[PDB]
Design a protein that fits this description.
Shape of chain C: globular
Largest sheet of chain A: 9 strands, antiparallel
Shape of chain A: globular
Helix content of chain A: 25-40%
Bound molecules: magnesium ion
Number of helices of chain A: 16
Cofactor (chain A): Mn(2+)
Subunit structure (chain A): Influenza RNA polymerase is composed of three subunits: PB1, PB2 and PA. Interacts (via C-terminus) with PB1 (via N-terminus).
Chains: A alpha+beta (514), B mainly alpha (125), C alpha+beta (675)
Family (chain A): Belongs to the influenza viruses PA family.
Structural class of chain A: alpha+beta
Radius of gyration of chain A: 30 Å
Protein name (chain A): Polymerase acidic protein
GO molecular function, one term (chain A): metal ion binding
Helix content of chain C: 40-55%
Strand content of chain A: 15-25%
Number of helices of chain C: 23
Oligomer: part of a larger assembly
Largest sheet of chain C: 4 strands, mixed
Structural class of chain C: alpha+beta
Strand content of chain C: 5-15%
């Protein structure tokens, strides 16, 4: 006979944790024990106000308005590394296969370019010490030649802790913690004012950046490991889906961005835990097989790391990011708010028009990251899985209705064309290949420009989409607080260029969807 | 004056004494390395971190009698290093592969019957 | 041509490509929203919905406590905490009528549990508030700390093993006026009670309260298990069925005239409204005609939650512009602090909560913290779905649906439009009487044939097939042998449970193998890639006749595919292995294994174990005082050697005297005589 009892401190809490009227758990216990229903609900329904209701505003082809995008100065680039503007010094490295040394891969790339000019500032950082950005680039060039002075060549380089580097990496810009018993009264002391982030307007470049992400390149950016021979019927269908997709995604720019993501974030995390309190130079490297197929190493630029005594996953690492580019920053300056761009040399480019001399720039900016945000970038290959699963899930679904697998039709019917774009004339369709790369770019940008604003806009807009779908299905859709839903969607549209384009993309759909 | 007087203080505590006479200048960087991966706490990285090291795997001291110190190419397969609890030594994943190509062969006729619970999943396919 | 992915929905229906509306598929790198400012908004809004109720002063806590239940009916559509005891019990009465025996039987099976359940169970779980050290901590550590206090104070019943006995100690702990822990640390009865009833940052609860919450959710499970409408705690594919069922139920009866509408449901501020006292009312009605001991243990959880306190994390960060200072004010002295330091938005938030603030914690008698009574709250939700039967409505409109915590899906049938509108209102209002506030913003309604429930998107009999959270398909970090089994197991399990498509699983397998080989330097033997292992693995590759035999960790080919994933690799390749290879791979005389006596793995040489204080840091810091040394030399004889060199160089150049040179050489020979 088990016996558990409520007494003392517990019984007095038990007696105080009841409905009003009841002063005693035992009294209440007895009410419930001997309770029988007496249309209590049916009664209190009639007692309740008729102003308490869920009246159904019907959703017509007329009721939904275009989302209102905010007004303000044009939005700025906030990605870690350059995307469409990025430029790379490449070496063909055939005989040495497998994991090498990045420092030397960079120096080898650097030595392929003999066009370095006396560096001058072209478009400065309004909110920054621009001379420091120039000195840092000169210091890189300098310290790289100083390795060929050292008796024994080092594995990695640690930049000398100069003024300009100490500045850029934010050394001695964290103020001292002072017990509030000691600094009790200070006559300029306000809390960490979490200001209303000033709204920005949707600029053109974000769409340009994405358009260029959906394009093919002359370089296989992913080389996936082998798989068991196909046996079961599903395995043959599976491999067909995968290979067809893997084929059209292989050389897509988005996949270069994925690799840039992995290599850089990988190299930054390894340094952040290895050389904790050294200002390590961290080359921005990717690799690809050429269209003929030789292993080719790419240098996009450099990242100098700050102090990285990282305890938590949230703890920050300040870094400077010097990245080569051919794009003139004076064409869309609103983009390069955060950047101080230098002009550091002249390239020759053997294009359709014989060969043309262009100037080479260096988009330098201050920046930071955490173990969580580095890991995020390291796991960017999941974008491939996310992209394939969307394609795979559609096929699975469109096949359900017919009852037969459409894997073959989708990919092989070269007449079967999906609406995925707009042009001056109107809505343009494309190949299943264009859809694969488009869906990949989406997953990649969803990663690259990952924000809470996106999370929200994704979740709330989904509802409006599904409502519109019901209107097209002629399923007499109805809403309860449609104005409330819009306010929740629009609450997410502030300054993030990616979330703003997605909202433009919505309005663009909503017009054609009716 | 103060630094050499302090060294005499740490050699009077017999636990700090046995970290100074055992540990070598070369094997301070190896003690510090794998604690930088315990900050990471994600075991997937902690492994990648350790596999970078020369000798991450632990084994019985009898390995030193069983497999050679270096292979044909002159790669070191194990090192006489201090392990935590007992007289286990540190070993490179080279040694595991080395064993699987030059090791002793015992008769594995009993293994389909010892791991019958596992092997029966193959019979249905 | 400007690419716009959303234009796909002009051709493909939204349910088919709903996969494309989920941006991340994985936890993103911020999950921001758990500040001190955010906790105080929960505390405020919880009271604001429940603000017409009776204020009491707690005898034991000495805390202002709001009781909105049996309170005034709402006359607006804003969220109401004002539940109605007579209504709840009636809903629970008509549930037991519609499912005769559900409570009695579910109690019998839970009486089996409550006894057999062990304290061991309590170590499993997320972050917990450790009242022993006034911090958040791992679950297992928070219990070890708590039993160490209960061991020090005369509460040794926990060391019987069973959980019900650990509770019996937690009960007796409240009555004791002193509470002492050898960390000796002394807490008066009042300060102890605050911490025993604390939620710490939304926020995790104490170790005292957690015990009971299990047995309640355990009872709430056995109930949900016996209900068709409950979407918990059933598996992956098992749930897709329930969507098909409830439509098929309401669409086969339905003649030509009878309309059917499904409403895609989501309830607003679910946790902040429904009151602990209401859960006590439910439990006591379920456990009528039952033994007193069982009735009691289950009653304890709601009681504690009705008396609970929410600590405001750490506090707020300040900053001086000119002076270049910053200071962190705690929560404890945020009541006894000046308001002119804060901003306009933060002042009002502190001025509203300050009446509730008692001992650096805010009193919170109404509402709850997220995901605590998920299963019991589902019973309440279902009890309102239950009241949609032709009999209970007594009208031409009737309803059914599916509920799981705050998410729900409702199908209303009626002979005409006005009938549907009526049936909806009757549900919406019957819901208000028990503290359930349907979100007008989040929710919508359409003709039956398409809807969403727990992110399963039903479209005319098909629910779209995609995994919404993929796990890290990378390495697991145990060793070569295990990680393979785990990684291959993880994919199979994600296909059967998590509804992962095959083509995606094949690519998932590829990305695992890629990571596996990179991590363990075990790239295929025929490839040209260079590592340390490249040589050894190629020497083995050349030696070996049947190479399909070789494991991936021995530079062998990946033979896994959809069909294989359940087989252990060693079994899979067993026939194809060379006699001598197999002879070595499995020879348990090998120095790597140790023991040789939820993943399935054969023990091989690959089943190896990698490498695993203030005394290590002290020696390393003193080494920096000597070198701001030879490789083979130990720490002490590379310290004692640097001392004599600086002693004889400072004696020549004339930095230290003959007295200060003789003192160094004397001490340098006292260190050598200890070695
Ligand atoms: Mg829902």
């Amino acid at each position: 006979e088990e016996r558990f009892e409520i007494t003392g401190t517990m019984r007095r809490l038990a007696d105080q944790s009841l409905p009003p009227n009841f002063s005693s758990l035992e009294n209440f216990r007895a009410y419930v024990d001997g309770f029988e229903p007496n249309g209590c609900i049916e009664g209190k329904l009639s007692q309740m106000s008729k102003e308490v209701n869920a009246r159904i505003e019907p959703f017509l082809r007329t009721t939904p308005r275009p989302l209102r995008l905010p007004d303000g100065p044009p939005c700025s680039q906030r990605s870690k590394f350059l995307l469409m503007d990025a430029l790379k010094l490449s070496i063909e490295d055939p005989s040495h296969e497998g994991e090498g040394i990045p420092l030397y891969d960079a120096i080898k790339c650097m030595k392929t370019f003999f066009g370095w000019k006396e560096p001058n500032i072209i478009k400065p950082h309004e909110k920054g010490i621009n001379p420091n950005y120039l000195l840092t680039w000169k210091q890189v060039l300098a310290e790289l030649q100083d390795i060929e002075n050292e008796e024994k060549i080092p594995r990695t380089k640690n930049m000398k802790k100069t003024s300009q580097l100490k500045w850029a990496l934010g050394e001695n810009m964290a103020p001292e913690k002072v017990d509030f018993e000691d600094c009790k009264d200070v006559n300029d002391l306000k809390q960490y004012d979490s200001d209303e982030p000033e709204p920005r307007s949707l600029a053109c470049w974000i769409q340009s950046e994405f358009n260029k992400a959906c394009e093919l390149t002359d370089s296989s950016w992913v080389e996936l490991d082998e798989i068991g021979e196909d046996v079961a019927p599903i395995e043959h269908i599976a491999s067909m889906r995968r290979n067809y997709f893997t084929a059209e995604v292989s050389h897509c720019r988005a996949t270069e961005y994925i690799m840039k993501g992995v290599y850089i974030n990988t190299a930054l995390l390894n340094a952040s835990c290895a050389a904790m309190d050294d200002f390590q130079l961290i080359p921005m490297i990717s690799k690809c097989r050429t269209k003929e197929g030789r292993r080719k190493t790419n240098l996009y630029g450099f990242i100098i790391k700050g102090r990285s005594h990282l305890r938590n996953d949230t703890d920050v690492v300040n870094f400077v990011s010097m990245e080569f580019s051919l794009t003139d920053p004076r064409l869309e300056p609103h983009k390069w708010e955060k950047y101080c761009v230098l002009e550091i040399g002249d390239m020759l480019l053997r294009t359709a028009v014989g060969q043309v001399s262009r100037p080479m720039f260096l988009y330098v900016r201050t920046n930071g990251t955490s173990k969580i945000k580095m890991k995020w970038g390291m796991e960017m290959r999941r974008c491939l899985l996310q992209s394939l699963q969307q394609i795979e899930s559609m096929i699975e679904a469109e096949s359900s209705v017919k009852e037969k697998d459409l894997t073959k039709e989708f990919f092989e019917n070269k007449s079967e064309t999906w609406p995925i774009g707009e042009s001056p004339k109107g809505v343009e369709e494309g190949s299943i290949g264009k859809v694969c790369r488009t869906l990949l770019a989406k997953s990649v940008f969803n990663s690259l420009y990952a924000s809470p604003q996106l999370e929200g806009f994704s979740a709330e807009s989904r509802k409006l989409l599904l409502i519109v779908q019901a209107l097209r299905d002629n399923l007499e859709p109805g809403t309860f607080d449609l104005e409330g839903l819009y306010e929740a969607i629009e609450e997410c549209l502030i300054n993030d260029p990616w979330v703003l384009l997605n909202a433009s993309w919505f309005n663009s759909f909503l017009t054609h969807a009716l | 004056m103060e630094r050499i007087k302090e060294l005499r203080d740490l050699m009077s505590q017999s636990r700090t004494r046995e970290i100074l006479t055992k540990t070598t200048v070369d094997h301070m960087a190896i003690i510090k390395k794998y604690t930088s991966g315990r900050q990471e706490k994600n075991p997937a990285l902690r492994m990648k971190w350790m596999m970078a090291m020369k000798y991450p795997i632990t084994a019985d001291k009898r390995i030193m009698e069983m497999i050679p110190e270096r292979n044909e190419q002159g790669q070191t397969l194990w090192s006489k290093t201090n392990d935590a609890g007992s007289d286990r030594v540190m070993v490179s994943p080279l040694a595991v592969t080395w064993w699987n190509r030059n090791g002793p062969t015992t008769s594995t006729v009993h293994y389909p019957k010892v791991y019958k619970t596992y092997f029966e999943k193959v019979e249905r396919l | 041509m400007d690419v716009n992915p959303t234009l796909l929905f002009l051709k493909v229906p939204v349910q088919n490509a709903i996969s494309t509306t989920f941006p991340y598929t994985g936890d993103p790198p911020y999950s921001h929203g758990t500040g001190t400012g955010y906790t105080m908004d929960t505390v405020n809004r919880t009271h604001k919905y429940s603000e017409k109720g009776k204020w009491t002063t707690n005898t034991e806590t000495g805390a202002p406590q709001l009781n909105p239940i049996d309170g005034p009916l709402p006359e607006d559509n804003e969220p109401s905490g004002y539940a109605q005891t007579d209504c709840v019990l009636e809903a629970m009465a008509f549930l037991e009528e519609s499912h005769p025996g559900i409570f009695e039987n579910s109690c019998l099976e839970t009486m089996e549990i409550v006894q057999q359940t062990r304290v061991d169970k309590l170590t499993q779980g997320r972050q917990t508030y450790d009242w022993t050290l006034n911090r958040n901590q791992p679950a297992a550590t928070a219990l070890a700390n708590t039993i160490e206090v209960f061991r020090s104070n005369g509460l040794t019943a926990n060391e019987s093993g069973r959980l019900i006995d650990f509770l019996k100690d937690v009960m007796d702990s409240m009555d004791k006026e002193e509470m002492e822990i050898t960390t000796k640390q002394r807490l008066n009865k009042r300060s102890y009670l605050i911490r025993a009833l604390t939620l710490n940052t939304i926020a995790t609860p104490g170790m005292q309260i957690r015990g009971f919450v299990y047995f309640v959710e355990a009872l709430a499970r056995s109930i949900c298990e016996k209900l068709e409408q409950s979407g918990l705690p059933v598996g992956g594919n098992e749930k897709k069925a329930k969507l098909a069922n409830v439509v098929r139920k309401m669409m086969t009866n339905s003649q030509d005239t009878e309309l059917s509408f499904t409403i895609t449901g989501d309830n607003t501020k679910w946790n902040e409204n429904q009151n602990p006292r209401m859960f006590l009312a439910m439990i006591t009605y379920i456990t009528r005609n039952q033994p007193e001991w069982f009735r009691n243990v289950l009653s304890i959880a709601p009681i504690m939650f009705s008396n609970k306190m929410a600590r405001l994390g750490k506090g707020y960060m300040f900053e001086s512009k000119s002076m270049k200072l910053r200071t962190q004010v705690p929560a404890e002295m945020l009541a006894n602090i000046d308001l002119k330091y804060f901003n306009k938005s933060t002042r009002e938030k502190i001025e509203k909560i300050r009446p509730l603030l008692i001992d650096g914690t805010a009193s919170l008698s109404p509402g709850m913290m997220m995901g605590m009574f998920n299963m019991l709250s589902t019973v309440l939700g279902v009890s309102i779905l239950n009241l949609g039967q032709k009999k209970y409505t007594k009208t031409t409109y009737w309803w059914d649906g599916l509920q799981s915590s705050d998410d729900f899906a409702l199908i209303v049938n009626a002979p005409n439009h006005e009938g549907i509108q009526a049936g909806v209102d009757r549900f919406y209002r019957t819901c208000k009487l028990v503290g359930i506030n349907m979100s007008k913003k989040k929710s919508y309604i359409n003709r039956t044939g398409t809807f969403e429930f727990t992110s399963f998107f039903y479209r005319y009999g098909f629910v779209a097939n995609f995994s919404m959270e993929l796990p890290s398909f990378g390495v697991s970090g145990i060793n070569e042998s295990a990680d393979m089994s785990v990684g291959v197991t993880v994919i199979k399990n994600n296909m059967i449970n998590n509804d992962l498509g095959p083509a995606t699983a094949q690519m998932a397998l590829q990305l695992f193998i890629k990571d596996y080989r990179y991590t363990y330097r075990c790239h295929r033997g025929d490839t040209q890639i260079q590592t340390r292992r490249a040589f050894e693995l190629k020497k083995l590759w050349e030696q070996t006749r049947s190479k399909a035999g070789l494991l991936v960790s021995d530079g062998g080919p990946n033979l896994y595919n959809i069909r294989n994933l359940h087989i252990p690799e060693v079994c899979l390749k067993w026939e194809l292995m060379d006699e001598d290879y197999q002879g070595r791979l499995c020879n348990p005389m090998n120095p790597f294994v140790s023991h040789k006596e939820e993943y399935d793995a054969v023990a091989t040489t690959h089943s190896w174990i990698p490498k695993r204080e203030q005394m290590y840091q002290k020696c390393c810091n003193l080494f920096e005082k000597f070198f701001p040394p030879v490789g083979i030399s130990s720490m002490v004889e590379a310290m004692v050697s640097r001392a004599r060199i600086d002693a004889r160089i400072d004696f020549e150049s004339g930095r230290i005297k003959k007295e200060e040179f003789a003192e160094i050489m004397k001490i340098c020979s006292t260190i050598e005589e200890l070695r």
